[PDB]
Amino acid sequence: ERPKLILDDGKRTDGRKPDELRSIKIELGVLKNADGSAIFEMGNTKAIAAVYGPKEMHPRHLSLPDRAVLRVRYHMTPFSTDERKNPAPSRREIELSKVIREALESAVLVELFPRTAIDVFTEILQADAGSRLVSLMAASLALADAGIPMRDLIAGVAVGKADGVIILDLNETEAMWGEADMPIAMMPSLNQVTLFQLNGSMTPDEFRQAFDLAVKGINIIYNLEREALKSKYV
């Protein structure tokens, strides 16, 4: 709304074309004590996740008789941001814990383990836009790394509009000053959307262009998640 988000050369503030992703880096089995672990970086957005494998949930009236219960935490460290975030969970963090959980719920073959809980803890170490998605993907990989069966991996990317241009994988500047910001996550092999939100505004047509660009970006990310996982064995 103030800075120029698309320059006269038609590129973005970080030099990317509108259809270009930030660089990605994945690491597996980083935490010795967790049943499953991962770090996912997407440009300057960094997340780590730990999974604690299916275990009988004590309550137990919180357990489910037919399936496992997912417990998930999205949380940002105080130094993950530009100004220090208070470590107490914000309304935003609470919402995102639920949105991320519900995304995983469609992936994780939970009925294999009734009366159990599976704990997914993700921390945002660096937040430069798209962290709910980076948190999601870390979680997905940590589950994979923990040997908890799943339908598919989850890949996700945010699309938006900035200065009227539909763009792929927004950096923080684009999120703050852009017109729309729309994170999308799927199980790509199954063509199923697991996370879908929009804030800002778009015409219905912009929404359809933006959505089509998101899928193409997600396929690239998905391939990466797949190699990352296969890497140590190959």
Binding site: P54, E56, T116, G147, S189
Partner: protein, 213 residues
Amino acid sequence: SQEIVLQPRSIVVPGELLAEGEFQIPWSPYILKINSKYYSTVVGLFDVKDTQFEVIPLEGSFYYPKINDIVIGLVEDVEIYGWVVDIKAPYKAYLPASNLLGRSINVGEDYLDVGDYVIARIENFDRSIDPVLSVKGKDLGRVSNGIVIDIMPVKVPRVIGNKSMYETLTSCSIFVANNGRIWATCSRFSEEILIEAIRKIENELTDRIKQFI
């Protein structure tokens, strides 16, 4: 049309298509059949026994209770008529005092306690109950001597083979529970076989490794 898609022995991943069509494969937690497609649910290794396929998981800290499996448990609690036992699964196992005692519990009576290891078999288990253990078998019951090494349950068949891997190792007197735990008694330097197990989870051969060490 019936076809397998992946070269056998491939490195497979959750969401990965293994084969298309109508096969007659025993349901398995590592394969998902969605209509006429079959996908892997885990990071694993594709395999084709004869005409059937399977995914061998490469990950997982957890054991899944199977009736009649032999496991080594860790007593984690003492109840009024039995013991609570950790057999490294999602669910805790139970050991009825009547099973261990072969009789009812007497007035004022108090064999196994917390921190004890117990080799046992699973007398009961299903989707709707926790595993019940039985020690009424030869060589079952409390574990006195020796050591216990923990490893990924998913790695147990790789320490086994055509009984191959086992033979190698004992050249040392070990026992490999399905539990994903291994009883041993060797002296303490010989025990450092432990390092050779670690390398097996580290590479799912080692013969050379133990002659020099």
